[PDB]
Design a protein around this ligand. Structure first.
Ligand SMILES: CC(=O)c1ccc2c(c1)OCCO2
Ligand code: NI
Ligand code: NI
Length: 331
């Protein structure tokens, strides 16, 4: 219950944090893995906001409070956690750097913040679960249930004393940025991805795609969100595989709860069906990941490394299916 708030020690600590000089170069690359640098994660986000938006885009005090409170409102779940938030924000940073002038100042600050906040207060349960068992959230939010909650959580944090990083915007720009953030967070509902990608592919293939058209912009931004949300499939194989272990820990825990409620889970969520995982991944790459990064690369050519990496990981899953895997380590 209630919104969690960082301590003075936490935000003042972040204010005084300095990134190691060696990481500056690394952070620009799509394949960068934040994994080995946990103590630096909030600082990495500050650095990214500063590089993309400028050191004077936000009041530093308010920015540091906001970041550390956002961290405090991610739960200790295996996958939809603070690490995932920063990973998604980093992918967006790399996309924005490679495509900087396609996006307005307002959009860049809105999108980096949207990515950091996009899974706020996730409980480790899918929209499917919440609706099946009529959680209060499914009553409140009929579609895109968790995503509407994550937006609500974002607004609650902005409303904490001294946390409104957007207050200095004009009343019109303020409204615009909250709308950018809302649409971006809602777009992370994979249910909406399938139609969005199909629409974009059509607009691209016919040549009607126009980034001066607000609805087109919204859709491109939506696909960017999907691309950043799924970006664990664009890392080096060992990183991708370790992350898959984490998401399946959530899935299996949800399936366990379904069994308690008298219903057999989908196989993906059944910890007694781990043999089906590699084929399940193949399905996910073929149905979601590969088409996403394919269309994104068509629209934003500099994002091609994401697609190349995704393809490499699909090949690795195929190797697993054929029984060609080598030694793997788990945490
Ligand atoms: C590991 C990862 O990023 C990823 C993300 C979402 C998933 C998934 C894997 O497996 C299939 C269902 O959706
Ligand atoms: Ni989500
Ligand atoms: Ni996410």
């Amino acid at each position: 219950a209630g919104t969690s708030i960082c301590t003075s020690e936490e935000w003042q600590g972040l204010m005084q944090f300095t990134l190691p000089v060696r990481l500056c170069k690394e952070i620009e690359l799509f394949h960068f893995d934040i994994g080995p640098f946990e103590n630096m994660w909030p600082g990495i986000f500050v650095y990214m906001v500063h590089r993309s938006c400028g050191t004077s885009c936000f009041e530093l005090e308010k920015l540091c409070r906001f970041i550390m409170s956002v961290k405090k409102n991610y739960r200790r779940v295996p996958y939809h956690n603070w690490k995932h938030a920063v990973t998604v924000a980093h992918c967006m940073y790399a996309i924005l750097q490679n495509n900087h002038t396609l996006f307005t100042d307002l959009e860049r600050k809105g999108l980096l913040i949207a990515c950091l906040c996009h899974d706020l207060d996730h409980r480790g349960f899918s929209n499917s679960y919440l609706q099946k068992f009529d959680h209060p959230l499914a009553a409140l939010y009929s579609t895109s249930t968790m995503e509407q909650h994550h937006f609500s959580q974002t607004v609650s944090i902005l409303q904490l004393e001294g946390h409104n990083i957007f207050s200095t915007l004009s009343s019109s720009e303020y409204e615009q940025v909250l709308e950018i953030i809302r649409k971006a967070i809602i777009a992370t509902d994979l249910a909406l991805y399938f139609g969005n990608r199909k629409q974009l592919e059509e607009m691209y293939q016919t040549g009607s795609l126009n980034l001066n058209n607000q609805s087109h912009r919204d859709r491109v931004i939506g696909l960017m969100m999907t691309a950043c949300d799924l970006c664990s499939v664009t890392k080096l194989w060992p990183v991708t595989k370790l992350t898959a272990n984490d998401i399946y820990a959530e899935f299996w825990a949800e399936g366990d709860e379904m069994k308690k409620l008298g219903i057999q889970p989908i196989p993906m969520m059944d910890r007694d069906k781990k043999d089906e995982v590699p084929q399940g991944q193949l399905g996910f790459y073929n149905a979601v990941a590969i088409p996403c990064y394919t269309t994104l690369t068509q629209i934003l050519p500099p994002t091609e490394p994401l697609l190349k990496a995704c393809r490499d990981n699909l090949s690795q899953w195929e190797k697993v299916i054929r029984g060609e895997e080598t030694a793997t380590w788990i945490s």
